[PDB]
Enzyme design. Sequence first.
Site, PDB file in Angstrom:
ATOM      1  N   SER A 152     -25.903 -25.730   3.044  1.00  0.00           N
ATOM      2  CA  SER A 152     -24.456 -25.768   3.445  1.00  0.00           C
ATOM      3  C   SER A 152     -23.833 -27.148   3.160  1.00  0.00           C
ATOM      4  O   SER A 152     -22.580 -27.241   3.191  1.00  0.00           O
ATOM      5  CB  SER A 152     -24.260 -25.299   4.871  1.00  0.00           C
ATOM      6  OG  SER A 152     -24.551 -23.906   4.977  1.00  0.00           O
ATOM      7  N   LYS A 195     -20.996 -26.961   0.798  1.00  0.00           N
ATOM      8  CA  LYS A 195     -19.646 -26.555   1.189  1.00  0.00           C
ATOM      9  C   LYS A 195     -18.638 -27.650   0.845  1.00  0.00           C
ATOM     10  O   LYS A 195     -17.479 -27.361   0.575  1.00  0.00           O
ATOM     11  CB  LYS A 195     -19.635 -26.134   2.665  1.00  0.00           C
ATOM     12  CG  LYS A 195     -20.113 -24.700   2.875  1.00  0.00           C
ATOM     13  CD  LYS A 195     -20.181 -24.220   4.283  1.00  0.00           C
ATOM     14  CE  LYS A 195     -20.597 -22.764   4.347  1.00  0.00           C
ATOM     15  NZ  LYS A 195     -22.031 -22.589   4.170  1.00  0.00           N
ATOM     16  N   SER A 248     -20.031 -23.532   9.402  1.00  0.00           N
ATOM     17  CA  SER A 248     -20.895 -23.320   8.205  1.00  0.00           C
ATOM     18  C   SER A 248     -20.900 -21.833   7.851  1.00  0.00           C
ATOM     19  O   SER A 248     -22.001 -21.196   7.861  1.00  0.00           O
ATOM     20  CB  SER A 248     -22.311 -23.834   8.430  1.00  0.00           C
ATOM     21  OG  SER A 248     -22.393 -25.248   8.315  1.00  0.00           O
ATOM     22  N   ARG A 282     -30.998 -33.596  13.600  1.00  0.00           N
ATOM     23  CA  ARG A 282     -30.295 -34.118  12.404  1.00  0.00           C
ATOM     24  C   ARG A 282     -29.326 -35.223  12.831  1.00  0.00           C
ATOM     25  O   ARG A 282     -29.440 -36.365  12.351  1.00  0.00           O
ATOM     26  CB  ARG A 282     -29.592 -32.996  11.646  1.00  0.00           C
ATOM     27  CG  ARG A 282     -30.542 -31.949  11.088  1.00  0.00           C
ATOM     28  CD  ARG A 282     -29.816 -30.724  10.575  1.00  0.00           C
ATOM     29  NE  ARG A 282     -29.016 -30.052  11.597  1.00  0.00           N
ATOM     30  CZ  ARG A 282     -28.217 -29.020  11.360  1.00  0.00           C
ATOM     31  NH1 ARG A 282     -28.094 -28.516  10.140  1.00  0.00           N
ATOM     32  NH2 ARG A 282     -27.523 -28.501  12.352  1.00  0.00           N
TER      33      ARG A 282
END
Lengths: 243, 244
Positions: A48, A51, A96, A228
């Site tokens: 993603s 994107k 997402s 993350r």
Amino acid sequence: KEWQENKSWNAHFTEHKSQGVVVLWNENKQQGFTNNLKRANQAFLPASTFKIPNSLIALDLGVVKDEHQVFKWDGQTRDIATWNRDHNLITAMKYSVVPVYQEFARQIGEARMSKMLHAFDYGNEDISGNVDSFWLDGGIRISATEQISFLRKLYHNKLHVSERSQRIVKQAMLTEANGDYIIRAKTGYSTRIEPKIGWWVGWVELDDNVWFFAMNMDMPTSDGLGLRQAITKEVLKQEKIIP
Amino acid sequence: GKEWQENKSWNAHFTEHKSQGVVVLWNENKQQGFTNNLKRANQAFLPASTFKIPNSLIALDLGVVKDEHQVFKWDGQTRDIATWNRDHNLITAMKYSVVPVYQEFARQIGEARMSKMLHAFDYGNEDISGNVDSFWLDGGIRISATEQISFLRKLYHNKLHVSERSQRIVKQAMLTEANGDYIIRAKTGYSTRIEPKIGWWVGWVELDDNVWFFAMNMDMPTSDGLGLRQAITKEVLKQEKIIP
């Protein structure tokens, strides 16, 4: 020295029984820092994080008119609740929403998607696979360091798409802001091809500097997705970039 | 769907801090207004630093500001706010409310263009009488909470007559706070040169599916309470379930 290794950041991966790389780029000093020079340059599926370029191409080609244009849920119930509704560019990025981007990709088409990734010098520039899934299970690969190269061109409005297209995507990337900093970023979770990894790429805007960042980490289950951001932030804190 | 409703329970939030003022909300989806005080909601005051929003737009549209990166050199006069005493761009000048930078923009814009622009914007009483570089602090210009909302709604929808680019850049510059729940683009103000001394906070809350515009002002005898501008607005937003 272009790149400096700082292995003390591994304490932040170890604390959370995790493995991965954080790459920082100090825009003012033109200097990079990472806990792992090797993994910093290891190319993976963007998932993603794709994107960001997909948004730019969609806007520039008129597939997306603006950040307000509504993309109607197709009515297929998927496993992520937030995907099962209408979306615009802002909400589709935030959650997402793959199905929206798969539709953008089909309208962009193979030939224009390819020409654009070449012009962007994006990763290995390889769109082999399905035009609507190649960033999840196709040929495209990008390293943490190559994410930063691309993000710096976006930040400075240097990609060959309009200034307008770049401003709108940077609006859409907005993730966090307070009195101390602004983060424009995109998350990614690659699950379709091993190894399963989590991404966070983007930048921290300070009063007087920009710190670009790209992290990836081994992500066997979705239970650790929160690491993350949390690990990137422990690194930003250690380096005094955020209080 | 009565256009404007009074909700006096919000005064509990002014009372808690022994303060007086107005919060005005506008639900963009429902086209409905809410306030704790309809009278004060329509009382016009000096805009003070809330004027940095229209001033930014005019400076950008005329090319006085090339972009959000262009550097405005400190003039070397040490002022009372430490953060003013350095070079700035549009982003940092807005963030820290750096008057001297905007006074320089205003001098380059000039009387005639500043006047034409405020008329086209339908901005408050559209009166720039006084010094072109100080009129928003001690000149003729006045604007109410409800008139701030009218102007902010045009900016949000890119409906002012200046370029889309000018409007996007100012909206970037207005960014104040953002998390998983909302985005606030806003501008603070503290009017001290003419009574009554008031604090301003004007802007909007972006949610996934709606925009809530807001304009608050409150009596600000000393700068000790400046923090209440945001804290009281947020108690109102919380009460109305707009933010968690």
